[PDB]
Amino acid sequence: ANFVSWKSRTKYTITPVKMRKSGGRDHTGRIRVHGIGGGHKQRYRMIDFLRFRPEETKSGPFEEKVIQVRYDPCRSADIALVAGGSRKRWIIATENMQAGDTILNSNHIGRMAVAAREGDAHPLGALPVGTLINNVESEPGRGAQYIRAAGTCGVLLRKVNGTAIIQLPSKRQMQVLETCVATVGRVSNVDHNKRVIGKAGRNRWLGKRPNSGRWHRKGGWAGRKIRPLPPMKSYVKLP
Amino acid sequence: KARGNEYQPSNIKRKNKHGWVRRLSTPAGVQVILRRMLKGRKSLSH
Amino acid sequence: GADRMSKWTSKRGPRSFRGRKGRGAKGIGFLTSGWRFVQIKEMVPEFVVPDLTGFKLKPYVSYLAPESEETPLTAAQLFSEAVAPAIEKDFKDGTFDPDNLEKYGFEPTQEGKLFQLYPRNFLR
Amino acid sequence: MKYMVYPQTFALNADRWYQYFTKTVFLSGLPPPPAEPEPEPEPEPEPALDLAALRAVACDCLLQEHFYLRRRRRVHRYEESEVISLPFLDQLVSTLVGLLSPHNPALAAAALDYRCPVHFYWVRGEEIIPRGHRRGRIDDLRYQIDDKPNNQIRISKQLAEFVPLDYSVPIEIPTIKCKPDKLPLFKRQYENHIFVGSKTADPCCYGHTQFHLLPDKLRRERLLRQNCADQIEVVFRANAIASLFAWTGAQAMYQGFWSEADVTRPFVSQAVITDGKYFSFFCYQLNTLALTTQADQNNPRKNICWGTQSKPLYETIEDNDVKGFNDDVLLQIVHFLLNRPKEE
Amino acid sequence: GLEEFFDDPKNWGQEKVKSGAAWTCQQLRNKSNEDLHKLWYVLLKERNMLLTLEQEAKRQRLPMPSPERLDKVVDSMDALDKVVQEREDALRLLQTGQERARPGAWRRDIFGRIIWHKFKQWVIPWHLNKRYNRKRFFALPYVDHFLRLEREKRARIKARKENLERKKAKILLKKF
Amino acid sequence: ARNVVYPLYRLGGPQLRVFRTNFFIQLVRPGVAQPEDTVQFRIPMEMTRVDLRNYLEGIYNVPVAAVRTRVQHGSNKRRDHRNVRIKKPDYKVAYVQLAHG
Amino acid sequence: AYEWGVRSTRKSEPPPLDRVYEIPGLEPITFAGKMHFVPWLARPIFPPWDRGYKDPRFYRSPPLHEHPLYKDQACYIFHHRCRLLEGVKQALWLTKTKLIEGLPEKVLSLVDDPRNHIENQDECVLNVISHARLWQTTEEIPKRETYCPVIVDNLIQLCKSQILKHPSLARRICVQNSTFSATWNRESLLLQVRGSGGARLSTKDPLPTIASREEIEATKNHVLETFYPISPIIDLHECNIYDVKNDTGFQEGYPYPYPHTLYLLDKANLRPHRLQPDQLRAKMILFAFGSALAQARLLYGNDAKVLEQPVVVQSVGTDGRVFHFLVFQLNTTDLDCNEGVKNLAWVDSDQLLYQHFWCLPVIKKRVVVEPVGPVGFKPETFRKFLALYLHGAA
RNA sequence: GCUAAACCUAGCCCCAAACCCACUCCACCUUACUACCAGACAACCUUAGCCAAACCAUUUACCCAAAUAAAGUAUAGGCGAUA
RNA sequence: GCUACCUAAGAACAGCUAAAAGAGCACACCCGUCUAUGUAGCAAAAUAGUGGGAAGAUUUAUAGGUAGAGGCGACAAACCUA
RNA sequence: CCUCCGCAUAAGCCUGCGUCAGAUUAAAACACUGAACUGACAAUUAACAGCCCAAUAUCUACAAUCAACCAACAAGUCAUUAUUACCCUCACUGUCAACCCAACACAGGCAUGCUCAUAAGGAAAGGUUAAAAAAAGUAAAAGGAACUCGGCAAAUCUUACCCC
Ligand SMILES: [Mg+2]
Ligand SMILES: [Mg+2]
Ligand SMILES: [Mg+2]
Ligand SMILES: [Mg+2]
Ligand SMILES: [Mg+2]
Ligand SMILES: [Mg+2]
Ligand SMILES: [Mg+2]
Ligand SMILES: [Mg+2]
Ligand SMILES: [Mg+2]
Ligand SMILES: [Mg+2]
Ligand SMILES: [Mg+2]
Ligand SMILES: [Mg+2]
Ligand SMILES: [Mg+2]
Ligand SMILES: [Mg+2]
Q: Which ligand has the minimum distance to the alpha carbon of residue B3?
């Protein structure tokens, strides 16, 4: 089984790289994840999820400029290439972001809060209490991983001394270090749940095989579970 | 229907599925060739 | 089924097999990036044919030729016929030196001259 | 199943084979000028052709592509006939049709194309299929010429003829007593095309003079190294004959003429075939067209193809100038581009 | 020219041709080097002419006039080749001192057979080649049984041959 | 020469020269129609075009213009007495042409 | 930071050596003599190997940290692919030139004369367009690459055929395959232009000065806009290995040194491969600026000062349906500061020659609607092209 | 009397003795029967099962050290068919 | 290599109504609801139409992978060389 | 008289209706002599598709659908730069055919271009008489599903109701 991954590019670029579908085939060849296979050909875009990043021979804050908002078939939300300086990198677009916009990627935490807009990004230590944020990180200098879909957003709860509890869309609390950069606002491409499918042709184009036709008797896990909220998971390492 | 033409003539698939390189790239095919030489096969593989 | 007893020639494979098989022809060059052949004049066997003007020797021998005994031409006979007289001549006077033997035809290595014997640089 | 008559072939005595396949003859030398119309008004303006300016612009266009040129590698010996002589040829024909516009008004409305293919299809001769499931049955011998010149000059009207249609020549056409498959000639099967350089809706159906160029495979030194001293003019003659025959066929099959329906007026054609230094001149006049065995039973008309030897234009370009420059070649070149259509 | 591929025009169909007594090994060893080379060229031309004559006779559906001349030229050229090979081997032993100009070594393949591997003469060395490293040279503990079975088969063959020889000897002693 | 290992030529090495060749050409009469300049031969399976040109211009000294060769595959259908195919030896015919007409 | 390197796709690390090389004073018994890879404990360490004789097919180039043309600073080379974002903005910022909407009155006064026209210009250009669009090849729908240079050379020949009227057009030649080179400074930023367009027109006599000294002195008060979120070195080939030079495509002794009109072609059969109109305008602006700078360096030496005799290097870029005219004029060479004298250029944007061409007649309900022919035609584009072509020879 | 019936030799199995062999030149690890180019990773593992005990879950000579009597003795074995 | 699924590069679909359509009739094409012929037949599964689709959940040329204590499965215990 | 065929490309053993002698015997479902043969004679020559690309770093977001109006969604089938070194050149594989897979000379199956019927190609019939029975085709004085469980071949051209 000569199964080689198509992720063979160790340098960030702008040209969309061609991707190969899998259909539930790992390195052995057996189907391990059912429901994937047969879809329309797509091209992968190298999306830079890390918001704040210094350029070559740079350190201070820098300005950007939104050019054009396109669409990404690999996810639900749409992407938008934002130019700035002497390089162009793909980032996740936010709500009410059109052509000719100006966003800021700062990092110096101030004494008081900053009344930023819904396009620029600032660390959680300079944002007021009760602000719709998105693309929150977990470790300083790691990358945005949580809240990255279409329309998803989180709201700041409270602050203690060096942490920042962020309310996740799953109604679950989660704290993180204060020196973490997170975007402000909501992701674009809203009303995604109202997208009526219509026919199975759309699902076949997206690359999703129909479910199994076997009649499985529901065991004891098919009932409704009225469970309380799980405790807040902490990522701050304490000696 | 007319189930009888169960063979498709092709040399690429034949060489890639039952070739000498594929046979000797695995001790299974090597043992097969050894048994063929022990029996008296004039032709070892394709 | 297909044939098995017959050998693999150049009229069995599809369009992707006609070319890399051949009939055992010796290559005299290589290829480039424009589907061209770069033939090197130093790779084609140059036939050296001597002149046959004043050559008085027929390919067939007459029956009036007397026969003789057959014996292989070993290296010892050639040695005793070529190097032995010179060695005896230089030793009978008083000038032989077992340190240097390159003046009799012996070569310590084969990387000096062109026509080497053990690696065989010449064709035939 | 039809043959592929390649004009730029590497065969030996392919000229006689092409003359047999096209029913053409060859006459060494340029055709005589038409001395039928006596021009009594020879004393008027008459713009003098200043050969000095023509030679100057020719040497300038030659040194532009041969001597000095901002290149980006060295100068590889290969593909040197495609990046040096090929641009020089189109530059020369462009400056010629530009300078010969006041002297010849026919070149003002002429469409000067750059590398356009010319195709032609016809039937010539028959045979008997020896093998196959169609043995003992008569079949036709179809041919096809896929030529692609460098520059063509297409005008609106037809040029003046040279010899009449009922011209007789004692030199018969060459014949062969062998199968046409002996020289490097093969039979394929694809779409039949009869193209001249433009579609039938173009009002410029006729032409003037074409220009060709031999590739790097048919050089002079390569033929001299392969023990082929007399194989220098035969290839030029065969290429010229094939190109002129294809051109005349494409021009005749656009007015309603073919195998059965003959022609009502001859079609004069000119072509200037050159290589990297030597220039050749050939002429042609389409006389007959029926080449099938059913129609070529009592057809005394034969095609005529004139021509001359290959003469060099320059000789060793060095010392930031030219050493030798023959004037008769340039004179014949500038004369073959001033042929005006017969207008009464 | 092209007329050397045929024999004398007067001998074009003379039933039997008188030509015999080919070369021997001693007469070829007695000659020098340029003479032997010219004689080899003459023998090659003669063999080519005889092959052309034989092909023409086979096409004309007629027997060859003298087929022994071809075999004579063949054995003469074979003797010349043997002589020049013996001379080359003697010179190599007097210079380098090793037999067989084709280098190699006794290596065991995957089948467990002790064969003589011949060097192919590459450009790049062997410690970085891609195709040469894929050529394995180890028995691996799974061919010992096959080698033992082949040895038993050869032993059975030899025993049956000896039994046949003994039966033949007994028949010879009984009848005679 | 055939059945002889050729020495590996290095970029810039001496000229590959052969003295005692091991090639045997056969002048076979053409079966079909052929012109007066095309001559048909029969070279072994280990012989190209330039090799045949050198062999014809070095020994016989025949001016050769062009060489066009192809492989001929012998018949393989004749059965013996124990039902077994009989393989015929293959050969390579040539079609050389003269130079000086 | 999320790395883009996959461990399964990169080269795997070699397995560690055996426990025999960690013994001080003990040589291993490997398989370096049998000359074949063994199963029996056999895996040594081979030293590096190099070739003593260089081979063009197996030649490795040294790294960039020791090249003879390597420098500490990085340059920015512009060619025929650098798709600039803010085309006009970057062009005016790198060339230091004031943008003018309308065209000069000289070409208008030369083209409005009814005598300087073809005997049947409309029908001639219509037949030329129809031929180049449909009657050029044997196919039905030709590709843009196979009819763009065709119609370009057809228009060139049509404009050249008027030599019998103006006895001065013989001093021109359509030069094919030419390279440009010009180096300059722009606020402590070393720049260089190096491109190779389709064709160019060179003459023996230079073009007359268009803008007089009045507008030249008045342009000094005009400031240039500068974008802040974007850097002017965007979409440029940033390389450290280069070579500074001020040599143009022709040395001394050439009969046609002075250019006239540059012809850039965007031969591309696909929309993503075709350049934007603003990108084409920026490209032609940069090409004209490089040509003018090379001419200034060749004539007035390599000095950074104001030129008393300005040069005019026109340019035009087509694509198969639209045209973009340009009249460029260089007035100074010192471009280190933005408070000096600027340049002047006349750019004519949005110039369509024809609306659409129908190669095949559309049939809707067994009847035709639009026949074969160029539907919609604007002769103003061809008039402006003829004016720019005849501006050189009065 | 047509169809068709017999005519002995290639040898075949086991003993005693003996330990048996493997390039004339070229091609043979890629599409073996292919002359010629840049990631070197590739073995080291309780065999199982049928049958029998009227089923079957413990168990069932096969294990590669020359004979025999001891002796089928002490022993192991749902203490039983067996070893 | 027939058949279930997946992967990369290609090809196929006249004409009319085209309501914008996983629209209709209908060539070539994918499958086969029924009648008639034979069950040692043309065939260890055929012959014509009456048939459904035929701009897309369609078909197909090439190459590779998923195999029995399993593969696959729009679930027939269907298929894995009659 | 048919053409629901043929010619090429793709896949496939490679010599498989050319000549000569035997044609006494042997395979044609019978004969001439030859698509179910013995030996000898030689076809096919490339320009057709392959046999391919010297490296170090860097660059490539505005589809196709006549692509020019408009309009989208399944978000898409094609491009380079700077430097170093390299001016020896046309070698190799097949060009036959009535042919492949199904034990066969089988009413089975096979991908694209060409005029969708023509310039490609073939013969339902060995002869004698008109037995019964069976199968495939045209229609019939009156009824038009009254025969059959059921409109079961067939031609007219066919509406409404119920379940799923
Ligand atoms: Mg579901
Ligand atoms: Mg279900
Ligand atoms: Mg039991
Ligand atoms: Mg299914
Ligand atoms: Mg539909
Ligand atoms: Mg339908
Ligand atoms: Mg069920
Ligand atoms: Mg053919
Ligand atoms: Mg069958
Ligand atoms: Mg017919
Ligand atoms: Mg009958
Ligand atoms: Mg009735
Ligand atoms: Mg009833
Ligand atoms: Mg019915």
A: 9
**Count of domains in chain D?**
1
> Is the four-CA dihedral G65, G71, G76, G77 of positive or negative sign?
negative
B34, E143: Cβ pair inside 8 Å? yes
DSSP 3-state assignment of G258?
strand
Q: Which of residues 11-30 of B touch E (CB under 8 A)?
A: 24, 27, 30
As a whole number of angstroms, the distance between CA D134 and CA D138 comes to 9
Neighbours of F67 (CB within 10 A): 19
Query: Cα(E37)–Cα(E47) distance, rounded to whole angstroms?
Result: 15
Q: Are G347 and G99 in contact (CB under 8 A)?
A: yes
| A74 domain-assigned | yes
Per-chain residues with Cβ under 5 A from ion ligand 1: A 211
Q: How was this structure determined?
A: cryo-EM
In a domain? residue G30: no
Helices (H) then strands (E): counts for chain G: 7, 13
How many structural domains compose chain B?
Answer: 1
Contacts of F12 in chain G (CB under 8 A): 53
Expressed in angstroms, the distance from the first to the final Cα of chain A is: 47
Resolution value in angstroms: 3.0
In a domain, G15, yes or no: no
Q: Which of residues 2-31 of B touch C (CB under 8 A)?
A: 7, 9-12, 14-15
Domain range spanning residue A32?
A: 1-106
The region that residue C25 occupies, defined by phi over 0 for left and psi between -120 and 50 for alpha, beta otherwise, is beta
Domain that holds residue B36: 4-46
CATH assignment of the domain containing F80: 3.30.70.330
Cα atoms in the 13 Å half-sphere on the side-chain side of D301: 19
Strand partners, G175: G200
Q: What are residue D203's phi and psi, to 5 degrees?
A: -65, -15
Tell me the C-alpha distance between A84 and A101, whole Å. Answer: 12
How far E77 CA sits from the closest chain F CA (Å)? 10
How many angstroms is C1' of J127 away from CA of D139? 39
Domain extent for F67: 1-101
Nearest residue to A50 via CA among A159, A149, A180:
A180
Q: Where are the alpha helices (DSSP H) in chain D?
A: 14-22, 51-65, 80-83, 85-99, 220-225, 233-252, 327-336
Within this chain, do residues A101 and A4 fall inside the same structural domain, yes or no? yes
Q: What are the phi and psi torsion angles at G100 (to 5°)?
A: -120, 135
Helix (H) or strand (E) holding C47: strand C46-47
- Strand H proximal to E167 Cβ, under 7 A: yes
How many domains are there within chain A? 2
Residue G90 contacts residue G232 (beta carbons within 8 Å):
yes
What separation, in Å, do the N-terminal and C-terminal C-alpha atoms of chain E show? 68
The DSSP bridge pattern shows strands A154-159 and A163-167 to be antiparallel
Domain that holds residue G113: 67-393
Please give the structure tokens belonging to residue E61: 């559906």
The chains in contact with chain G, meaning 3 or more Cβ pairs closer than 8 Å, are: A, D, E, F
Which tokens belong to G289? 């600026």
> What is the tally of structural domains in chain F?
1
* Closest Cβ opposite residue E126 in set G35, G38, G40: G35
CB pairs under 8 A between B and E: 16
Q: Give the three-state DSSP class for G191.
A: strand
At residue G180, what is the residue type?
F
Number of independent structural domains in chain G: 1
**Contact between residue G223 and residue G191 where contact means Cβ atoms under 8 Å apart:** no
Verify if strand H has an atom below 7 Å from the CB of F12. no
Query: Chain C closest CA to E4's CA: distance in Å?
Result: 13
Dihedral Cα E2, E8, E14, E20, nearest 10 deg: -110
Q: What is the CATH number of the domain that holds B27?
A: 1.10.287.3980
Please name the residue ranges forming H helices in G210-336.
Answer: 213-218, 277-299
